[PDB]
Symmetry: C2
Subunit: 92 residues, 2 copies
């Protein structure tokens, strides 16, 4: 049974993985979302708000439920190294 | 009751609206998704594949179910003007 919140959990790791594959930065993502989507927290601040720990555990659950690639938790998350990752697109 | 497919329906109009608010183009989106997410069709070809008509009708359903902003169908879609929209970020 799915929540509305699961949809931002999945959006988030969509975002995460893009950043993981180097096709975008945490920033252009957050801003375009915030600006385009007119909301207060982009995927990543959202992620920071929530916690890598929580979102993954949850994404796991869904991966079992569905077995689609999209639901499987980004490694950035499943291993909490989120913060060093912002460093990547943010640092240089 | 939600399907796995609903998650790409919502991703799509996430994408759509970004493009609607001018913060990205249909292209940088499709490619970053395809490249970063290593899949065959970006949000928009996906959308083209499916049809503005179908995705909206469906997004509607979810908006009633949840009443979160994220689920409400982009106007680009709910009015099928999808194709002229690719023109925007694609044309100039």
């Amino acid at each position: 049974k799915i929540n509305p919140m699961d949809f931002t959990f999945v959006e988030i790791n969509e975002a995460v993985k893009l950043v993981e594959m180097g096709v975008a930065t945490p920033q252009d993502i957050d801003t375009a979302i915030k600006l385009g989507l007119n909301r207060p927290f982009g995927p990543f601040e959202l992620a920071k708000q929530f916690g890598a720990e929580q979102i993954a555990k949850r994404l796991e659950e869904l991966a079992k439920q569905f077995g689609k690639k999209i639901f499987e938790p980004a490694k950035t998350l499943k291993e909490g190294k989120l913060e060093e990752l912002l460093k990547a697109g943010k640092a240089e």
